[PDB]
Amino acid sequence: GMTEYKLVVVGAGGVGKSALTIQLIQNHFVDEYDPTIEDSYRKQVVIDGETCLLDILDTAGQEEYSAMRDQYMRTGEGFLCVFAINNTKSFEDIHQYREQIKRVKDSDDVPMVLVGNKCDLAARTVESRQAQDLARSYGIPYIETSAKTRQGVEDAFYTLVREIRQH
Amino acid sequence: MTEYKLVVVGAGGVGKSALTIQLIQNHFVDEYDPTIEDSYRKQVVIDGETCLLDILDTAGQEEASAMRDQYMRTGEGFLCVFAINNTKSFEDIHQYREQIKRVKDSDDVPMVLVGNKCDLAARTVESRQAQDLARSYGIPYIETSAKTRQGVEDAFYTLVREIRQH
Amino acid sequence: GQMRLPSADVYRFAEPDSEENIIFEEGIPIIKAGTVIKLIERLTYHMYADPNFVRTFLTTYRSFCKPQELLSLIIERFEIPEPEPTEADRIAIENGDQPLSAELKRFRKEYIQPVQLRVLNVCRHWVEHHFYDFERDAYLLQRMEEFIGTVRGKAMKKWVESITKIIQRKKIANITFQSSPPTVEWHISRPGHIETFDLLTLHPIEIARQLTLLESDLYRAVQPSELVGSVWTKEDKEINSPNLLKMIRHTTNLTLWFEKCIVETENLEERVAVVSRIIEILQVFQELNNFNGVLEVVSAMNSSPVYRLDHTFEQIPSRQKKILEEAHELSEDHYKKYLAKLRSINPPCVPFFGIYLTNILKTEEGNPEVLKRHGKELINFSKRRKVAEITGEIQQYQNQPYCLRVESDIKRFFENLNPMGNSMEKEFTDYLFNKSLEIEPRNPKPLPRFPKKYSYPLKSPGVRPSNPR
Numbered sequence: 001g002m003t004e005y006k007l008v009v010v011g012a013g014g015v016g017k018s019a020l021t022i023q024l025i026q027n028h029f030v031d032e033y034d035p036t037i038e039d040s041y042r043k044q045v046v047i048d049g050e051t052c053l054l055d056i057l058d059t060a061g062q063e064e065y066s067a068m069r070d071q072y073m074r075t076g077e078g079f080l081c082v083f084a085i086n087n088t089k090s091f092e093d094i095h096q097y098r099e100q101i102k103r104v105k106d107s108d109d110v111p112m113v114l115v116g117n118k119c120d121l122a123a124r125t126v127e128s129r130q131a132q133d134l135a136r137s138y139g140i141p142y143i144e145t146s147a148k149t150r151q152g153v154e155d156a157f158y159t160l161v162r163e164i165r166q167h
Numbered sequence: 168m169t170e171y172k173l174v175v176v177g178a179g180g181v182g183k184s185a186l187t188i189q190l191i192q193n194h195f196v197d198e199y200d201p202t203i204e205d206s207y208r209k210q211v212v213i214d215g216e217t218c219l220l221d222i223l224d225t226a227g228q229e230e231a232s233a234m235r236d237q238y239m240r241t242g243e244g245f246l247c248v249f250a251i252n253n254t255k256s257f258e259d260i261h262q263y264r265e266q267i268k269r270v271k272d273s274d275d276v277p278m279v280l281v282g283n284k285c286d287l288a289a290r291t292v293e294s295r296q297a298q299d300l301a302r303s304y305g306i307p308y309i310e311t312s313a314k315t316r317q318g319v320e321d322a323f324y325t326l327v328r329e330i331r332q333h
Numbered sequence: 334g335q336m337r338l339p340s341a342d343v344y345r346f347a348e349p350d351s352e353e354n355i356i357f358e359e360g361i362p363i364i365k366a367g368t369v370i371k372l373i374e375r376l377t378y379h380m381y382a383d384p385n386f387v388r389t390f391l392t393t394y395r396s397f398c399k400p401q402e403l404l405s406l407i408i409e410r411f412e413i414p415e416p417e418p419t420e421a422d423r424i425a426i427e428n429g430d431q432p433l434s435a436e437l438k439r440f441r442k443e444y445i446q447p448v449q450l451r452v453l454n455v456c457r458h459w460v461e462h463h464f465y466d467f468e469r470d471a472y473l474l475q476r477m478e479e480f481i482g483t484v485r486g487k488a489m490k491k492w493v494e495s496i497t498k499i500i501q502r503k504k505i506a507n508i509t510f511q512s513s514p515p516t517v518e519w520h521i522s523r524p525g526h527i528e529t530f531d532l533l534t535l536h537p538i539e540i541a542r543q544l545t546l547l548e549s550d551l552y553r554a555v556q557p558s559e560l561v562g563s564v565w566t567k568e569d570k571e572i573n574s575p576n577l578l579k580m581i582r583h584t585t586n587l588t589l590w591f592e593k594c595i596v597e598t599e600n601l602e603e604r605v606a607v608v609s610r611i612i613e614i615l616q617v618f619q620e621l622n623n624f625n626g627v628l629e630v631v632s633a634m635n636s637s638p639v640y641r642l643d644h645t646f647e648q649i650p651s652r653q654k655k656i657l658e659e660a661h662e663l664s665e666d667h668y669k670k671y672l673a674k675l676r677s678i679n680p681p682c683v684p685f686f687g688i689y690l691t692n693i694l695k696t697e698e699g700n701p702e703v704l705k706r707h708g709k710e711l712i713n714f715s716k717r718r719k720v721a722e723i724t725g726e727i728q729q730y731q732n733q734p735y736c737l738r739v740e741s742d743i744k745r746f747f748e749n750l751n752p753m754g755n756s757m758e759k760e761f762t763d764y765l766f767n768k769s770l771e772i773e774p775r776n777p778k779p780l781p782r783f784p785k786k787y788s789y790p791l792k793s794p795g796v797r798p799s800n801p802r
């Protein structure tokens with residue numbers, strides 16, 4: 001029946017990456033989560049009038065298992081590459097995540113979006129122009145999100161689904 | 168996975184904690200540190216079925232004797248432990264048996280009678296006397312050593328079988 | 334009737350329950366949220382004990398209460414005032430008679446002694462299972478020693494004297510099986526000849542056994558202090574989570590060693606022998622319930638350098654293709670079959686830690702520290718219970734030891750494995766991928782031939798154990 005999209009979240013640890021999927025899948029209006037619950041990472045949505053099922057893999061917390069990244073990444077059809085806007089190192093990591101995705105998928109044109117995540121009130125160190133320039137150099141969209149207000153969260157995932165649909 | 172709530176009861180110093188820690192960790196505790204209340208979990212396959220044992224290790228010292236109803240209500244089966252070199256601990260068994268029956272309002276509570284410290288030569292409770300008591304309760308009698316592991320799995324897993332057939 | 338309580342003005346833990354200080358979940362109650370005073374009251378409640386509450390609380394409390402403040406609060410809880418004589422007692426004393434003191438005796442037996450015993454049980458569990466608070470704060474330990482060492486009165490004496498000794502033991506600080514472990518197995522490399530040890534020269538049974546002992550020890554060493562607060566992801570992770578990181582780094586190193594053994598074997602026939610041997614090791618890992626080891630192999634076979642080696646995969650025997658594919662199926666659909674298998678086996682086992690890490694991290698990030706109710710902020714205890722359910726599962730699998738004999742030289746060989754050498758990660762993983770491209774070039778480039786590198790027999794001894802008398 002309805003299309004299922006397998007999405008994979010990648011990016012540096014320790015900087016609030018997990019808030020993106022939690023806020024999406026969450027009871028939007030009750031701040032609560034049990035990740036152990038069967039299908040705490042599946043969500044039926046309507047994007048541009050077409051109903052589909054999102055299956056989101058976010059292995060946040062497992063970043064030190066670096067030799068597992070290839071296997072996790074190969075499961076995905078589209079990728080959210082996430083950095084924290086107050087952590088320049090996480091932004092500099094993006095290039096290698098994208099190169100690794102391209103190698104694992106054996107393609108120079110993998111659906112992906114660049115996501116800049118505001119995870120606290122600490123001072124921003126990556127300006128939006130820097131991230132827009134990076135995303136344009138890759139030919140991919142850029143979305144900024146808040147880890148606290150849910151702003152941008154739907155846009156990040158829906159934009160990625162549109163990249164898959166238009167591949 | 169079925170969950171089973173087991174409770175280990177008996178006089179102070181008979182080896183309730185040593186029995187439990189031998190089952191859980193395969194380690195014999197030499198020290199005598201009187202228990203207030205400890206709890207353990209163990210996943211184990213018994214008769215081909217996986218279950219989860221919740222084991223409550225209780226206080227045998229008399230100073231805690233007024234605090235037993237709370238754990239007897241929730242326990243599903245009871246290991247009633249005495250030491251075979253301690254006749255007073257054997258005489259204390261019937262007091263635990265009667266309290267469990269009163270609290271659970273039942274004549275048919277899963278139990279096993281355990282004679283511990285069977286590695287020690289200097290026995291003062293004969294097996295026959297304990298077996299007679301067990302028969303009067305309708306329950307099995309198993310002699311154990313927390314030190315050597317003799318009988319330890321048999322005691323706990325026999326109790327699980329009695330809960331499973333209850 | 335119920336016992337009367339001290340005035341809440343002299344004893345804070347007698348304040349009535351209300352929705353402004355405690356909220357229960359929908360036969361002991363389960364706490365959703367509460368003030369720290371109410372959490373400590375219920376932790377040490379006179380009517381019962383949740384045996385698991387003490388572990389949950391002591392594992393997670395530092396997210397809402399400092400260790401020094403916890404000790405102050407449980408000392409305050411312990412020091413319960415006794416009621417004054419009743420009218421009947423007064424009349425007896427006025428007549429020169431001894432009072433019955435029925436209400437006082439009941440309050441001692443049914444309120445003071447259970448609450449005080451449960452406070453001491455918190456202290457005992459704190460010292461025995463969460464001693465790091467005292468290792469990191471010597472003054473906290475002094476305060477605990479002084480408190481325990483000055484408790485008077487005979488009802489608590491046995492436990493006070495015991496806890497004093499336990500503390501002194503902890504400051505300066507053996508397995509039994511019924512059956513014997515199986516005999517250590519040897520193949521081309523013989524005992525003592527560590528210089529010949531390698532993937533194909535050690536016995537595959539013994540590779541899997543010694544790696545399982547190593548990985549089990551690494552799994553068993555991880556304490557909850559390394560997990561609560563998601564500290565293994567934060568800037569001080571090397572300070573706060575050293576055993577967890579050692580465990581993960583071992584897993585990563587072994588996965589990379591498997592990949593390196595494969596792609597540095599340029600001859601196709603020899604490389605098939607290498608891959609087949611690693612799948613045999615995976616079979617023994619499965620037999621031993623070493624799921625960490627199982628996924629070490631699966632991760633290597635699904636890595637970019639190995640997964641693309643179609644000419645190698647084509648020559649793997651069908652039964653071994655099936656073993657690898659069924660092992661990979663454990664990870665599919667968010668580890669659905671792995672989780673079911675872990676919960677079905679008979680331990681000992683070595684779980685894969687990564688799922689626990691993700692679940693702890695997401696529980697902490699996805700739930701608020703406090704709940705706001707009637708203008709008050711209540712500690713969200715349900716969130717802490719969820720974290721402690723995960724740390725409790727971890728601990729349950731840390732109890733059971735493997736009945737396998739250590740081989741000190743094989744153990745040292747795997748402890749010292751260092752496939753990356755002095756290279757950085759990107760340099761090394763690009764090297765592995767370039768080797769993959771060399772030995773099996775992308776179509777339509779032709780497949781080259783390469784000379785053999787191993788001078789000893791490639792035939793496996795198999796993975797069924799042998800038993801001489």
Ligand SMILES: Nc1nc2c(ncn2[C@@H]2O[C@H](COP(=O)(O)OP(=O)(O)NP(=O)(O)O)[C@@H](O)[C@H]2O)c(=O)[nH]1
Binds near residue numbers: 184198199283286313
């Ligand atoms: N020889 C021998 N000693 C044992 C055995 N079981 C326990 N002991 C010893 O007996 C002492 C008391 O054991 P322990 O497990 O603390 O007894 P308990 O019944 O749990 N005591 P409590 O009711 O106060 O908590 C310890 O010194 C322990 O080593 C056994 O099977 N054999």
Ligand SMILES: NS(=O)(=O)c1ccc(Oc2ccccc2)cc1
Binds near residue numbers: 631640643646658659
């Ligand atoms: N997804 S899986 O685990 O079943 C799997 C299947 C085939 C693989 O290819 C190869 C396997 C071995 C050597 C070379 C190549 C890898 C992994």
Ligand SMILES: [Mg+2]
Binds near residue numbers: 185200201202224227
């Ligand atoms: Mg004990």
Ligand code: NA
Binds near residue numbers: 086087088
């Ligand atoms: Na920065």
